[PDB]
Protein backbone atom coordinates (compact mmCIF):
# COMPACT_ATOMS: atom_id res chain seq x y z
CA UNK A 86 0.00 0.00 0.00
CA UNK A 87 1.23 3.46 -1.01
CA UNK A 88 1.63 6.12 1.73
CA UNK A 89 -0.38 9.08 0.39
CA UNK A 90 0.97 12.44 1.52
CA UNK A 91 -1.23 15.49 0.85
CA UNK A 92 0.95 18.57 0.12
CA UNK A 93 -0.79 21.88 0.88
CA UNK A 94 -0.04 25.47 1.85
CA UNK A 95 -0.73 29.08 0.97
CA UNK A 96 -0.01 30.47 -2.50
CA UNK A 97 3.63 31.55 -2.82
CA UNK A 98 4.68 29.47 0.19
CA UNK A 99 7.09 27.40 -1.94
CA UNK A 100 4.74 24.43 -2.33
CA UNK A 101 5.42 23.98 -6.07
CA UNK A 102 9.16 24.42 -5.54
CA UNK A 103 9.13 21.67 -2.88
CA UNK A 104 6.79 19.49 -4.95
CA UNK A 105 9.29 19.69 -7.85
CA UNK A 106 12.26 18.88 -5.60
CA UNK A 107 10.50 15.96 -3.91
CA UNK A 108 9.12 14.36 -7.10
CA UNK A 109 11.60 15.57 -9.74
CA UNK A 110 10.35 15.51 -13.34
CA UNK A 111 8.08 12.43 -12.72
CA UNK A 112 4.59 13.92 -12.29
CA UNK A 113 1.02 13.19 -13.38
CA UNK A 114 -1.29 16.12 -14.23
CA UNK A 115 -5.05 16.25 -14.93
CA UNK A 116 -8.15 17.86 -13.42
CA UNK A 117 -10.26 17.10 -10.37
CA UNK A 118 -13.51 15.42 -11.40
CA UNK A 119 -16.28 17.76 -12.57
CA UNK A 120 -14.10 20.91 -12.30
CA UNK A 121 -11.17 22.55 -14.12
CA UNK A 122 -8.91 22.70 -11.01
CA UNK A 123 -5.58 21.00 -11.74
CA UNK A 124 -5.02 17.59 -10.17
CA UNK A 125 -1.32 16.86 -9.82
CA UNK A 126 0.60 14.09 -8.11
CA UNK A 127 4.02 12.45 -8.15
CA UNK A 128 5.97 9.69 -6.44
CA UNK A 129 8.76 10.68 -4.03
CA UNK A 130 11.94 10.45 -6.19
CA UNK A 131 13.95 8.93 -3.30
CA UNK A 132 11.13 6.66 -2.01
CA UNK A 133 8.65 5.51 -4.68
CA UNK A 134 6.44 3.87 -2.02
CA UNK A 135 5.42 7.47 -1.10
CA UNK A 136 3.00 9.44 -3.27
CA UNK A 137 2.61 13.22 -3.04
CA UNK A 138 -0.89 14.46 -3.77
CA UNK A 139 -0.48 18.12 -4.58
CA UNK A 140 -3.44 20.23 -3.50
CA UNK A 141 -4.26 23.77 -4.71
CA UNK A 142 -2.59 26.61 -2.83
CA UNK A 143 -5.19 28.10 -0.46
CA UNK A 144 -5.41 30.44 2.56
CA UNK A 145 -8.36 28.75 4.29
CA UNK A 146 -10.92 25.97 3.80
CA UNK A 147 -13.94 28.18 3.11
CA UNK A 148 -16.85 27.32 0.78
CA UNK A 149 -16.09 30.21 -1.63
CA UNK A 150 -13.58 28.84 -4.16
CA UNK A 151 -13.33 25.68 -6.27
CA UNK A 152 -9.73 25.24 -5.09
CA UNK A 153 -10.71 25.39 -1.41
CA UNK A 154 -13.53 22.90 -2.07
CA UNK A 155 -11.19 20.45 -3.83
CA UNK A 156 -8.76 20.59 -0.90
CA UNK A 157 -11.49 20.10 1.71
CA UNK A 158 -13.28 17.21 -0.06
CA UNK A 159 -10.01 15.40 -0.60
CA UNK A 160 -8.86 15.81 3.01
CA UNK A 161 -12.28 14.81 4.44
CA UNK A 162 -12.37 11.70 2.15
CA UNK A 163 -9.79 10.03 4.42
CA UNK A 164 -7.65 8.98 1.38
CA UNK A 165 -4.58 10.87 2.66
CA UNK A 166 -2.39 9.16 5.25
CA UNK A 167 -0.53 12.40 6.11
CA UNK A 168 -0.78 16.14 5.47
CA UNK A 169 2.55 17.85 4.62
CA UNK A 170 1.81 21.51 5.26
CA UNK A 171 4.16 23.98 3.52
CA UNK A 172 4.41 27.14 5.64
CA UNK A 173 6.19 30.39 4.73
CA UNK A 174 8.45 31.11 7.71
CA UNK A 175 8.66 34.82 6.75
CA UNK A 176 4.87 35.18 7.11
CA UNK A 177 4.23 32.68 9.89
CA UNK A 178 1.02 33.86 11.59
CA UNK A 179 -0.86 34.33 8.28
CA UNK A 180 0.22 30.87 7.05
CA UNK A 181 -0.78 29.08 10.31
CA UNK A 182 -4.41 30.17 9.84
CA UNK A 183 -4.80 27.36 7.32
CA UNK A 184 -2.64 25.06 9.49
CA UNK A 185 -5.16 25.18 12.36
CA UNK A 186 -7.88 24.01 9.98
CA UNK A 187 -5.70 21.24 8.54
CA UNK A 188 -5.05 19.84 12.06
CA UNK A 189 -8.81 19.77 12.66
CA UNK A 190 -9.38 17.39 9.70
CA UNK A 191 -7.85 14.65 11.85
CA UNK A 192 -5.23 13.64 9.26
CA UNK A 193 -1.88 14.13 11.08
CA UNK A 194 -0.03 17.25 9.98
CA UNK A 195 3.74 17.63 9.48
CA UNK A 196 5.00 21.18 8.70
CA UNK A 197 7.73 22.09 6.19
CA UNK A 198 8.70 25.46 7.64
CA UNK A 199 9.87 26.76 4.27
CA UNK A 200 11.72 29.98 3.22
CA UNK A 201 13.98 29.46 6.26
CA UNK A 202 16.95 30.94 4.33
CA UNK A 203 15.00 34.21 3.77
CA UNK A 204 14.19 34.50 7.46
CA UNK A 205 17.91 34.36 8.27
CA UNK A 206 18.42 37.31 5.88
CA UNK A 207 15.61 39.43 7.45
CA UNK A 208 17.22 39.26 10.93
CA UNK A 209 14.31 37.09 12.16
CA UNK A 210 14.35 33.79 14.11
CA UNK A 211 11.93 30.91 14.80
CA UNK A 212 12.64 28.32 17.47
CA UNK A 213 11.60 25.21 15.53
CA UNK A 214 11.25 22.67 18.37
CA UNK A 215 9.23 25.17 20.48
CA UNK A 216 6.96 25.89 17.49
CA UNK A 217 6.48 22.11 17.07
CA UNK A 218 5.83 21.63 20.79
CA UNK A 219 3.12 24.28 20.99
CA UNK A 220 1.44 23.45 17.65
CA UNK A 221 1.35 19.74 18.57
CA UNK A 222 2.78 18.77 15.16
CA UNK A 223 6.22 17.87 13.83
CA UNK A 224 8.02 20.84 12.24
CA UNK A 225 11.09 20.67 9.96
CA UNK A 226 12.86 23.80 8.67
CA UNK A 227 13.23 23.68 4.89
CA UNK A 228 14.57 25.78 2.02
CA UNK A 229 13.40 24.91 -1.50
CA UNK A 230 16.05 27.35 -2.86
CA UNK A 231 19.03 26.02 -0.88
CA UNK A 232 17.61 22.46 -1.10
CA UNK A 233 17.78 21.75 2.66
CA UNK A 234 15.45 19.81 5.00
CA UNK A 235 13.45 18.32 2.13
CA UNK A 236 14.23 14.60 2.58
CA UNK A 237 13.92 15.09 6.35
CA UNK A 238 10.40 16.58 6.21
CA UNK A 239 9.23 13.91 3.72
CA UNK A 240 10.52 11.17 6.10
CA UNK A 241 8.75 12.74 9.07
CA UNK A 242 5.48 13.11 7.16
CA UNK A 243 5.78 9.48 5.97
CA UNK A 244 6.00 8.30 9.65
CA UNK A 245 3.27 10.66 10.94
CA UNK A 246 0.08 9.09 9.60
CA UNK A 247 -3.52 8.15 10.40
CA UNK A 248 -2.08 4.65 11.16
CA UNK A 249 0.91 5.69 13.33
CA UNK A 250 -0.58 8.59 15.35
CA UNK A 251 -3.03 8.04 18.24
CA UNK A 252 -5.06 10.84 19.86
CA UNK A 253 -5.62 14.15 18.02
CA UNK A 254 -3.76 17.13 19.55
CA UNK A 255 -6.05 19.90 18.26
CA UNK A 256 -5.74 23.67 18.83
CA UNK A 257 -7.64 24.42 22.05
CA UNK A 258 -9.63 27.67 21.86
CA UNK A 259 -11.38 29.80 24.51
CA UNK A 260 -13.47 27.83 27.06
CA UNK A 261 -16.64 29.47 25.68
CA UNK A 262 -15.97 28.26 22.14
CA UNK A 263 -14.92 24.80 23.42
CA UNK A 264 -18.27 24.55 25.26
CA UNK A 265 -20.07 25.26 21.97
CA UNK A 266 -17.95 22.72 20.04
CA UNK A 267 -18.55 20.06 22.74
CA UNK A 268 -22.35 20.57 22.59
CA UNK A 269 -22.36 20.47 18.77
CA UNK A 270 -20.36 17.20 18.99
CA UNK A 271 -23.04 15.82 21.38
CA UNK A 272 -25.78 16.86 18.95
CA UNK A 273 -23.87 15.32 16.01
CA UNK A 274 -23.56 11.87 17.62
CA UNK A 275 -22.41 9.43 14.89
CA UNK A 276 -23.55 11.62 11.96
CA UNK A 277 -19.90 12.26 11.11
CA UNK A 278 -16.69 10.27 11.62
CA UNK A 279 -15.00 10.61 15.03
CA UNK A 280 -11.68 11.56 13.35
CA UNK A 281 -13.06 14.65 11.59
CA UNK A 282 -15.90 15.37 14.06
CA UNK A 283 -14.23 18.55 15.32
CA UNK A 284 -13.80 19.88 11.75
CA UNK A 285 -17.51 19.39 11.15
CA UNK A 286 -18.51 20.79 14.55
CA UNK A 287 -16.55 24.03 13.95
CA UNK A 288 -17.93 24.34 10.40
CA UNK A 289 -21.47 23.95 11.70
CA UNK A 290 -20.85 26.55 14.38
CA UNK A 291 -19.70 29.07 11.75
CA UNK A 292 -22.67 28.13 9.48
CA UNK A 293 -20.59 26.76 6.65
CA UNK A 294 -23.05 26.40 3.77
CA UNK A 295 -21.31 23.33 2.25
CA UNK A 296 -21.36 21.28 5.47
CA UNK A 297 -24.99 22.32 6.13
CA UNK A 298 -26.06 21.21 2.65
CA UNK A 299 -24.12 17.91 2.77
CA UNK A 300 -24.95 16.59 6.27
CA UNK A 301 -28.20 14.69 6.82
CA UNK A 302 -29.17 16.34 10.11
CA UNK A 303 -32.53 15.85 11.80
CA UNK A 304 -34.78 18.78 12.62
CA UNK A 305 -33.92 18.23 16.30
CA UNK A 306 -30.15 18.26 15.58
CA UNK A 307 -30.53 21.53 13.65
CA UNK A 308 -32.54 23.10 16.50
CA UNK A 309 -29.89 22.06 19.08
CA UNK A 310 -27.16 23.56 16.88
CA UNK A 311 -29.09 26.80 16.26
CA UNK A 312 -29.51 27.25 20.04
CA UNK A 313 -25.77 26.68 20.74
CA UNK A 314 -24.78 29.30 18.13
CA UNK A 315 -27.29 31.86 19.39
CA UNK A 316 -26.23 31.77 23.05
CA UNK A 317 -22.51 31.62 22.12
CA UNK A 318 -22.85 34.70 19.88
CA UNK A 319 -24.66 36.47 22.74
CA UNK A 320 -21.87 35.83 25.25
CA UNK A 321 -19.14 36.93 22.80
CA UNK A 322 -21.30 39.81 21.37
CA UNK A 323 -19.83 38.76 18.02
CA UNK A 324 -21.08 36.71 15.03
CA UNK A 325 -20.15 33.00 14.94
CA UNK A 326 -17.79 33.23 11.94
CA UNK A 327 -15.88 36.13 13.55
CA UNK A 328 -15.59 34.27 16.88
CA UNK A 329 -13.84 31.35 15.15
CA UNK A 330 -11.57 33.67 13.13
CA UNK A 331 -10.57 35.54 16.29
CA UNK A 332 -9.95 32.29 18.20
CA UNK A 333 -7.73 30.89 15.40
CA UNK A 334 -5.55 34.03 15.39
CA UNK A 335 -5.44 34.19 19.21
CA UNK A 336 -4.19 30.58 19.34
CA UNK A 337 -1.63 31.32 16.60
CA UNK A 338 -0.35 34.44 18.41
CA UNK A 339 -0.03 32.50 21.71
CA UNK A 340 1.88 29.69 19.99
CA UNK A 341 4.21 32.08 18.13
CA UNK A 342 4.93 34.01 21.36
CA UNK A 343 5.62 30.79 23.34
CA UNK A 344 7.81 29.68 20.37
CA UNK A 345 10.26 32.65 20.49
Ligand SMILES: CNc1ccccc1C(=O)O[C@H]1[C@@H](O)[C@H](n2cnc3c(=O)[nH]c(N)nc32)O[C@@H]1COP(=O)(O)OP(=O)(O)O
Nearest residue numbers: 095096097098099100101102142199200201203228229230
Ligand atom coordinates in the same frame (compact mmCIF):
# COMPACT_ATOMS: atom_id res chain seq x y z
C1 LIG B 1 11.89 33.15 -11.83
N1 LIG B 1 11.67 33.02 -10.38
C2 LIG B 1 11.64 34.07 -9.55
C3 LIG B 1 12.27 35.25 -9.93
C4 LIG B 1 12.27 36.36 -9.10
C5 LIG B 1 11.62 36.33 -7.87
C6 LIG B 1 10.97 35.15 -7.47
C7 LIG B 1 10.98 34.03 -8.31
C8 LIG B 1 10.26 32.75 -7.83
O1 LIG B 1 10.07 31.81 -8.59
O2 LIG B 1 9.87 32.65 -6.59
C9 LIG B 1 9.25 31.39 -6.26
C10 LIG B 1 10.30 30.72 -5.49
O3 LIG B 1 11.42 30.44 -6.29
C11 LIG B 1 10.70 31.09 -4.15
N2 LIG B 1 10.86 30.07 -3.15
C12 LIG B 1 10.16 28.95 -2.93
N3 LIG B 1 10.69 28.36 -1.86
C13 LIG B 1 11.70 29.09 -1.41
C14 LIG B 1 12.61 28.97 -0.35
O4 LIG B 1 12.58 28.01 0.43
N4 LIG B 1 13.56 29.98 -0.19
C15 LIG B 1 13.62 31.08 -1.07
N5 LIG B 1 14.54 32.02 -0.90
N6 LIG B 1 12.74 31.17 -2.08
C16 LIG B 1 11.81 30.21 -2.25
O5 LIG B 1 9.43 31.75 -3.81
C17 LIG B 1 8.50 31.87 -5.02
C18 LIG B 1 7.21 31.11 -4.70
O6 LIG B 1 7.43 29.69 -4.72
P1 LIG B 1 6.37 28.66 -5.35
O7 LIG B 1 6.91 27.30 -5.21
O8 LIG B 1 5.95 29.17 -6.69
O9 LIG B 1 5.07 28.83 -4.38
P2 LIG B 1 3.66 28.01 -4.49
O10 LIG B 1 3.86 26.81 -5.28
O11 LIG B 1 2.81 29.04 -5.18
O12 LIG B 1 3.26 27.78 -3.10
Ligand SMILES: [Mg+2]
Nearest residue numbers: 212213214215
Ligand atom coordinates in the same frame (compact mmCIF):
# COMPACT_ATOMS: atom_id res chain seq x y z
MG1 LIG C 1 14.96 24.85 19.70
